Design an enzyme around this catalytic site. Structure first.
Site, PDB file in Angstrom:
ATOM      1  N   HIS A  25      -4.657   0.061 -30.330  1.00  0.00           N
ATOM      2  CA  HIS A  25      -5.858  -0.690 -30.701  1.00  0.00           C
ATOM      3  C   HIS A  25      -7.078  -0.274 -29.893  1.00  0.00           C
ATOM      4  CE1 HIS A  25      -6.758  -3.845 -33.588  1.00  0.00           C
ATOM      5  NE2 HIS A  25      -6.786  -4.853 -32.760  1.00  0.00           N
ATOM      6  N   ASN A  73     -11.099  -9.265 -31.033  1.00  0.00           N
ATOM      7  CA  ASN A  73     -11.465 -10.183 -32.119  1.00  0.00           C
ATOM      8  C   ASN A  73     -12.783 -10.866 -31.892  1.00  0.00           C
ATOM      9  OD1 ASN A  73     -10.768 -12.147 -30.318  1.00  0.00           O
ATOM     10  ND2 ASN A  73      -9.252 -13.061 -31.635  1.00  0.00           N
ATOM     11  N   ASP A  98      -9.231   2.203 -34.473  1.00  0.00           N
ATOM     12  CA  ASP A  98      -7.898   2.478 -34.986  1.00  0.00           C
ATOM     13  C   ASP A  98      -7.784   2.045 -36.428  1.00  0.00           C
ATOM     14  OD1 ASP A  98      -8.190  -0.130 -33.551  1.00  0.00           O
ATOM     15  OD2 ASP A  98      -6.114  -0.520 -34.249  1.00  0.00           O
ATOM     16  N   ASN A 119      -9.195  -6.644 -36.884  1.00  0.00           N
ATOM     17  CA  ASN A 119      -9.769  -7.849 -36.338  1.00  0.00           C
ATOM     18  C   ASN A 119     -11.073  -7.650 -35.557  1.00  0.00           C
ATOM     19  OD1 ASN A 119      -7.577  -8.879 -33.382  1.00  0.00           O
ATOM     20  ND2 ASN A 119      -8.209  -6.843 -34.071  1.00  0.00           N
TER      21      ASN A 119
END
Length: 196
Positions: A25, A73, A98, A119
């Site tokens: 991520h 997020n 990603d 997210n």
């Protein structure tokens, strides 16, 4: 502010802390940190914008780099005020991230579209709209939605890491085109990448 579709803000998405630095991520962080090293752009603490940021010359163009330190997020809590403060329109923004929907070693430049379940992008598009550019760094998908956390928050095996690292290196070589506004040519040349 920004000017046309010369890219003048490059954002890398990721999570802060050593525990996340090697995780999938953080692919966007990897790209932007490598880009900053290539061009000698200092990434320094930016508490005002909840991030680490820099400013410097890429191939004759004044470019800003941003790594939100919000957690993924909440990335818009950095990107939105930063871009607004510096009067950077979405069309002059590149966001590296990603991409679950592409293989390790695949990389693509995309303009527009939704968050694709990501997210970090989900926290950005509601505010600035979709018309920014994305460097989609393939990381693969674990199968089910339930597994997406332990996947993106995992450290890829060495073969996959090598594949991603080669794709990222290729993209670094195409940033010159992007800061020059040559988005079509950059898209063609980035998207053509193959690992082998």
């Amino acid at each position: 502010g920004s000017h046309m579709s010369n890219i003048s803000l490059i954002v890398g998405l990721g999570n802060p802390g050593s525990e996340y630095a090697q995780t999938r991520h953080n692919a966007g962080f990897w790209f932007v940190e490598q880009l900053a090293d290539k061009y000698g752009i200092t990434l320094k603490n930016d508490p005002k914008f909840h991030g680490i940021s820099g400013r410097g010359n890429i191939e004759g163009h004044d470019v800003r780099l941003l790594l939100p330190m919000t957690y993924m997020n909440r990335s818009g809590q950095s990107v939105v005020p930063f871009s607004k403060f510096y009067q950077i329109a979405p069309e002059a923004i590149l966001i590296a991230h990603d991409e679950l929907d592409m293989n390790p070693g695949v990389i693509r430049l995309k303009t527009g579209g939704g968050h694709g379940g990501h997210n970090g992008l989900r926290d950005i598009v509601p505010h600035i709209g979709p018309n920014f550019h994305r460097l989609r760094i393939g990381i693969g998908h674990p199968g089910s939605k339930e597994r997406v956390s332990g996947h993106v928050l995992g450290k890829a095996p060495s073969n996959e890491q090598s594949l991603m690292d080669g794709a990222i290196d290729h993209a670094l070589s195409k940033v010159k085109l992007l800061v020059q506004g040559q988005v079509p040519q950059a898209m063609n040349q980035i998207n053509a990448y193959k690992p082998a």
